[PDB]
Design a protein around this ligand. Sequence first.
Ligand SMILES: OC[C@H]1O[C@@H](O[C@H]2[C@@H](O)[C@H](O)[C@@H](CO)O[C@@H]2O)[C@@H](O)[C@@H](O)[C@@H]1O
Ligand SMILES: OC[C@H]1O[C@@H](O[C@H]2[C@@H](O)[C@H](O)[C@@H](CO)O[C@@H]2O)[C@@H](O)[C@@H](O)[C@@H]1O
Lengths: 301, 310
Amino acid sequence: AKEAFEKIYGKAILSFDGVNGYDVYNCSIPFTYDGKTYIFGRVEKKDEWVHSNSILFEKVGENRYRRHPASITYNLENPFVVKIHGEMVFGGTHVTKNGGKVSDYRCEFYHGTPFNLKYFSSGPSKMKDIRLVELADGKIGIFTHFRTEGSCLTGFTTIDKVEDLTVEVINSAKLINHRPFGDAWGGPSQVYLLSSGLLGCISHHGYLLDIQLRIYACTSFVFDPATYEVYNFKIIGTKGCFPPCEPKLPHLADCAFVSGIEMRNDGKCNLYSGIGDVAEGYIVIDYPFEGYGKIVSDVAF
Amino acid sequence: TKPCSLIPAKEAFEREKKIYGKAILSFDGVNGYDVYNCSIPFTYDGKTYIFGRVEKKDEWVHSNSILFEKVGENRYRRHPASITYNLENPFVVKIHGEMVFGGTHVTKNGGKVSDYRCEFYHGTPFNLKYFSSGPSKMKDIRLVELADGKIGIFTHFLTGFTTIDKVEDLTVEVINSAKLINHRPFGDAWGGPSQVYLLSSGLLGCISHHGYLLDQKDGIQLRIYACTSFVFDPATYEVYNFKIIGTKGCFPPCEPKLPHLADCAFVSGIEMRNDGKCNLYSGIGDVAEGYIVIDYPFEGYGKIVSDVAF
Ligand SMILES: OC[C@H]1O[C@@H](O[C@H]2[C@@H](O)[C@H](O)[C@@H](CO)O[C@@H]2O)[C@@H](O)[C@@H](O)[C@@H]1O
Ligand SMILES: OC[C@H]1O[C@@H](O[C@H]2[C@@H](O)[C@H](O)[C@@H](CO)O[C@@H]2O)[C@@H](O)[C@@H](O)[C@@H]1O
């Protein structure tokens, strides 16, 4: 609601080459494959709305990524990755239009190796916020976000195998205790298995500050799959924490759309976020799940 | 019982056809994947291009559409600058001075196909912008710029036809309200529009796919696809000159993706040659793209005046 978060140990905006100067934002977390670092980016012209594609970028230098020409691209917004049963699960939002107007959107899921991803399922109509994680016992955890009916409710369910991911499973997910989130809307960008067996969630939450301001903040919480309880909900980042950048339009002046965290050698983490729907940056923050266990999941493909 | 009405015409075509040449296209830069069910070739900025459906031979419904630049005779390579499209069966047309690009976007549920619709993009060939989808489970939607500057739309429910003023006006509602064309020439064949051309007469030259299920005495069931053409009067919805113009056996040999596709040619369209004949491009056996050199199929109804010179 009104927290008192406004310590950062460093910050940067990433540079992206090979996309004709287009904006790149709302990225996946970085991942490794075959001795290199990669990231998926949402690529869009600054002056175009709902004209995104998701592109695979290879890290080529400090804070610098270049489109990898071998990879196919995906007709998707807000790409994301996770490791399930030793392979990549990749997703994003596929937008349908009717005569230029958005009419539908759904999450599309791919699995395989990073240069050989195969489409296997979509989530339900008008559900953007779906994230997967491998649980300690090898089941697959699924976070869902029920947004269509004016409500903003988060669900959680499990499946045994990734090709069991269906509309029916997602739609029937049991609701989590959402009372910690208050009037915020959103959900996880990246979910992590912790050494405790709990799940560390790095999430995006939106608020109207009261005419209103739209705020999109980087948040975290810890989730217990055994009880459906939520712990330690907090704000961990805002757009003002990142280096300045002119937002895509003025109404996005307080918009950070989180990507996720990466652990550092020094025990702190890089919090990656889309900012202003124009850029990707990171801030260096304290480990947000401190006391609930260390991250044991990885994106080392 | 009720053998498809098209079988006699298919058999007669195989007896009576005139083929002046043939080739299978070669594709570089897709890791040995199959490339089939292409767009027609087009030109842009002094080069020749074609969009291809790219899929591993032993994978079903795992396609992407890739832009290929022409390297040499019958040879194309993936153009690395282009984005790729998560689509089957890509196609192009020129409308109001720009490219309209389309293909089929497949939705799955737990690995199983649950839906598919045509997605449309517009712009220049390396800068295509998504603007609309057709209705659920309608693959074969084709556009053409009419003699009067309106946009003609062919639909498949039975083939329908309707018009719009500007490409942004292409909606599910417009497509679903299309009036049915004269069905009587087509009989009981399954089929759909492929590339549509404006003719100098103001009529439309339509390249189409038509086919049927064939049970074989001892053999397995084939899904025949043949390359067909007809001429269409947009004022009356009348169809002229419906005929077969290509079959898989006309093209160079290629082992089909699965045995039921041993007589599947899924047409792409025609390209005029300097000698007044045409290259008929087709997907063959869902594994390759080829062309056969044929007589101009709209002979007597006017010259093609539409273009894909972008
Ligand atoms: O713009 C802030 C925030 O809003 C949501 O997406 C918007 C836009 O990015 C997207 O093209 C359309 C259609 O899907 O929806 C929203 O207008 C978020 O999901 C996120 O993308 C964005 O940062
Ligand atoms: O396979 C013959 C012919 O059939 C249709 O497509 C098939 C297949 O290629 C496609 O992946 C799926 C899902 O759309 O549908 C059909 O099984 C045609 O549309 C054409 O693509 C193909 O040559």
